[PDB]
């Protein structure tokens, strides 16, 4: 990750030339892991066999927040494809002039 910004649990951080090692011939689920007790390095990245997002409330309680943000598929030699995780906006009521939908409503 050359220059990627992430907001996870309302916490902003930047990935500047941050390399994640991958499993070969596999679908790698890239996670941002936030542990507030690790004062010097609260954020770390992991490549996992499944989407292990845990929804841990780090702003109100204890625990490690794990949130998947990327899906990287490999061959035996390298990356074949990358798909990002959807960024969800949960809203109550919207007032809008115009909207463009590329997928479906």
């Amino acid at each position: 990750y050359t220059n990627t910004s992430i907001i996870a649990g309302g916490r902003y951080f930047e990935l500047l030339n941050e390399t994640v090692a991958l499993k070969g011939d596999s679908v790698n689920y890239i996670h941002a892991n936030i542990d507030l007790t690790q004062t010097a390095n609260p954020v770390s990245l992991s490549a996992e066999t499944a989407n292990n997002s845990n929804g841990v409330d780090i702003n109100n309680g204890s625990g490690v927040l794990k949130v998947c943000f990327d899906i990287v598929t490999t061959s035996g030699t390298g990356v074949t494809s990358t798909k990002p995780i959807v960024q969800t906006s949960t809203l109550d009521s919207i007032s809008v002039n115009d909207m463009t939908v590329s997928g479906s409503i």
Partner: protein, 53 residues
């Protein structure tokens, strides 16, 4: 390298957040690029001949 920002600094030097770091943060929250803006007129702008205040 991972640059952390929305985190407390016990020795008050660990995680300093700059104008560009917050600038990138605000862009992601509202969902804007460098081609669009967020504008609000609290009071209507006055027009005096070939000038706009």
């Amino acid at each position: 390298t991972i640059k952390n920002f929305t985190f407390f600094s016990p020795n008050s030097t660990e995680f300093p957040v700059g104008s560009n770091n917050d600038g990138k943060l605000y862009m992601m929250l509202t969902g804007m690029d460098y081609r669009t803006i967020r504008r609000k007129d609290w009071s209507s702008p006055l027009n005096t001949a070939l000038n706009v205040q």
